[PDB]
C-alpha cells in the first residue's frame, strides 16, 4: 500500500489498450450504412462469384475462402487464469464481421462505386466493367468485343487462389506472428513468478510460516520489488506493440476506402498492374484483399513519328499515337 499508486496506472493503461482494439475493428469494417443483399438469381454476364459469396449450407454462413482462412490460422490457459490474468472477448463476433463483408460485396457487385458516395444506383455488371476499362485508358468496345474471354480469365484466376493459399503454409505468417507474440509475453509473465530475487524462498506462505514478522518483512520486500519490475516491463512492451497495430489498422481502413469503394490511380497501392477492382474477406484478427488488375501482353515493334506534315501544316494525334 505504501509503495505508490503504480497499480492504478497499470490498470488504466491496459484499459486504454483494450478499448483501442475495438475501435480498430470498427474503423475497418463498419464503413457501410445499410446491409445490402444480393439478388436471388446469380447471373452477372458470365462472371462467377461463388467462391467469395456466403455459403447458405454451412452454419457459419461463410464463403469457402473464408472457411479456408479460418481453418488455416489457429491447460496453459488455466494456469494463467489462476494468477490474475484474464482475456476479454471482443465486442463484434465473427458472424457480425462476416455479415459486414458480405454487405460490402453485395453493394459493389450490384452498384459499382455508387453506394460509397450516396444512394446505391444499379447498373449491369458488364457495363460497370466497361466503365472501369475506360478508367485505365482502354475504350469500351475492347471489353464488349472480348466479354467471354475476359470472363473465363477472371474465373480461372479466382479458381487458382484457393490452391495457392492451401498449398503454401507460410502465406498467413503475419496473423500467426501476432498471436505467438502475445502468447509468449503472457507465458513469460506467468513463468517469472518462480524467481527468488535474493530471498530465501519464492513462496509467500513459507516465508510467513517460517519467520517472525520483523524478519519476514525484509524477505517480502525483495519479492515485491522484483514482481513489480516484471509487471512494468510487460505493460511497456504492450504499449509499443499496440502503437504498431494501430498503424496497420489505419492502413487497412484506407485501403478499404480507396480500393474497394472506388477505383485507384495510385501506382501499386491496390495490387500490381492497372487496378480494376478489389474484394474484401475477413480473417481471424485481420483482413484479406483480393485485387483484380489488368496486365498488357504480347507486344510488337513499330516505327513512329511525332507529327504528320500535310499541305504545309502540322497534324498531331488527338488522343493516340502514330505508327
Amino acid at each position: 500500500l505504501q509503495y505508490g499508486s503504480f497499480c492504478t496506472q497499470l490498470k488504466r493503461a491496459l484499459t486504454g489498450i483494450a478499448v483501442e482494439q475495438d475501435k480498430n475493428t470498427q474503423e475497418v469494417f463498419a464503413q457501410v450504412k445499410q446491409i445490402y443483399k444480393t439478388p436471388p438469381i446469380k447471373y452477372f454476364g458470365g462472371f462467377n462469384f461463388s467462391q467469395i459469396l456466403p455459403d447458405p449450407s454451412k452454419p457459419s454462413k461463410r464463403s469457402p475462402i473464408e472457411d479456408l482462412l479460418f481453418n488455416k490460422v489457429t491447460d496453459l490457459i488455466c494456469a494463467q487464469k489462476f494468477n490474475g490474468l484474464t482475456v476479454l472477448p471482443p465486442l463484434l463476433t465473427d458472424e457480425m464481421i462476416a455479415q459486414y463483408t458480405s454487405a460490402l460485396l453485395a453493394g459493389t457487385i450490384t452498384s459499382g462505386w455508387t453506394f460509397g458516395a450516396g444512394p446505391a444506383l444499379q447498373i449491369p455488371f458488364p457495363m460497370q466493367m466497361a466503365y472501369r476499362f475506360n478508367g485505365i485508358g482502354v475504350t469500351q468496345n475492347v471489353l464488349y468485343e472480348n466479354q467471354k474471354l475476359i470472363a473465363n480469365q477472371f474465373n480461372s484466376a479466382i479458381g487458382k487462389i484457393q490452391d495457392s493459399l492451401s498449398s503454401t503454409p507460410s502465406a498467413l505468417g503475419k496473423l500467426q506472428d501476432v498471436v505467438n507474440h502475445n502468447a509468449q509475453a503472457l507465458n513469460t509473465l506467468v513463468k517469472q513468478l518462480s524467481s527468488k530475487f535474493g530471498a530465501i524462498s519464492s513462496v509467500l506462505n513459507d516465508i510467513l510460516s517460517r519467520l517472525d514478522p520483523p524478519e519476514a518483512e525484509v524477505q517480502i520486500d525483495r519479492l515485491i520489488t522484483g514482481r513489480l519490475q516484471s509487471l512494468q516491463t510487460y505493460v511497456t512492451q504492450q504499449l509499443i506493440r499496440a502503437a504498431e497495430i494501430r498503424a496497420s489498422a489505419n492502413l487497412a481502413a484506407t485501403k478499404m476506402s480507396e480500393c474497394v469503394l472506388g477505383q485507384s490511380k495510385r501506382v501499386d497501392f491496390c495490387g500490381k498492374g492497372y487496378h480494376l477492382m478489389s474484394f474484401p474477406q475477413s480473417a481471424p484478427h485481420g483482413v484479406v484483399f483480393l485485387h483484380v488488375t489488368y496486365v498488357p501482353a504480347q507486344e510488337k515493334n513499330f516505327t513512329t513519328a511525332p507529327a504528320i506534315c500535310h499541305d504545309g501544316k502540322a497534324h498531331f494525334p488527338r488522343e493516340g499515337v502514330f505508327v
Partner: protein
Amino acid sequence: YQTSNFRVQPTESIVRFTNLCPFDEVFNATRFASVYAWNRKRISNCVADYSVLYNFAPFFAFKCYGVSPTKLNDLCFTNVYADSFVIRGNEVSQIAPGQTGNIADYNYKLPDDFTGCVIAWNSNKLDSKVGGNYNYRYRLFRKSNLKPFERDISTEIYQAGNKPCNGVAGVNCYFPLQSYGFRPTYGVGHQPYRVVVLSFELLHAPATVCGPKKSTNLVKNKCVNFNFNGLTGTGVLTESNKKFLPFQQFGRDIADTTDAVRDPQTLEILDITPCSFGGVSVITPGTNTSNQVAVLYQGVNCTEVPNVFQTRAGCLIGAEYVNNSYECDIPIGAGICASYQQSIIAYTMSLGAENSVAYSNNSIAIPTNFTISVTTEILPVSMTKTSVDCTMYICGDSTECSNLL
C-alpha cells in the same frame, strides 16, 4: 466501469500428518566430544516436540537463523542433524554462518548459508574439574583452512618454521592439539559450555520429522485451507485419477504449480483447484437520469454467485434480456449491449437497416438532382512542452543526497 474483484472464501481447515523422538539422551549426555573432533548424531523417523527440551532451560544463547524459534513446533523437517561438543564461553561468538574464528577456520567450519539453530548451556559444575580437566583439547594449527561441515581427526606434528623436525618438535614445531585450562577459579567465558547445533532442510524430500500436531478428517468439493505435511494451501480438494508412481508425491503443471498431493495417512491422490474469483463491472446510465445499476461478473458461471442472465462475457444481474435489436448504447461484449428504457435492458446489437438493390440485365438508375453538403473533421497537432529539474525533484535542498545522486 471496472471497480473491484470477487473471491470465494474458505470455510474450514484440513490438516494431515506415533512414536516419540528422543532428544534427552542427546542433550543429557554424560560426556561431550572435543571441539576438534565434534560428535554428530542423525535424527529422523520420529515425531518430536521442541518445547519439552525448552522446559529444562539451562540455555544461555538461542540463535535460529533459517527459522523462528516460536514456530519450530509447527514445522515438519527431514534429515535432522545434531552436532555436539563442549567449549568455554569465550568462543561462542565464533560459531555463526560466515563468521571468522580460530576454531571456525581451523576446527569446525559453519557454512554462511546455514539453516538451523545454535544453542549452548553452561554446565560449569559438571564439566569443569576442580583440579583441571585437560581431556578436552582443540587443534591449533594446520596447513590449510577447514571446509564447512568437515571433521578432522588426524593430529600430526605441525612445522612452525624452516627447521625440519619430523617428530623432533621443539622450536618452530608445535603440536596443534592443545588442552583447555579448566580452573574453577576461571570466570565467565572460561567455564565449560555444552554446545549443540541443529541442522535441518526444508522441502527437498518427503517429510520424516514432523512436529506435535493433530490430524483431522478430510473434506471435498469445498474451498478449504489445507496443511498436508507442511504444504499449506487453499482450494477445493477433489479425487484424482493421476497415474502417480509409488515414489511420486506431488504433481505440477506447465507453470510449476502444485496440481495433486497424497494424504500422509491414507495413500491416495487428490487434485487441487483454487476456488472461483473474477472481476466486477458496474453498468449505469447517467447519475442525473437515474440511480439503478446492473452488475457484471466477468467470466463466471451464474451458478457460482450468492434477473440473472448468462452471457459469454459472464453473469449479468439487474438487467432483463429482450428479443428486440437496436444500435449499441453501452457495450457489454460478445455482441451484447445494454440500455435504459424506466428499466435497464440487454439486447443483441443490430448492424443496420436492411436493403435490397433491384439488379437486372438492362436496368439503370440516374440521379435527377443534387445536394451540397459540409462536414467537419478535427485533428490534434501539438502537445504541452514541459521541463524538469532532476536534482531539485529528487533531492530538494539537501546537499547530502546530492553526492549520493
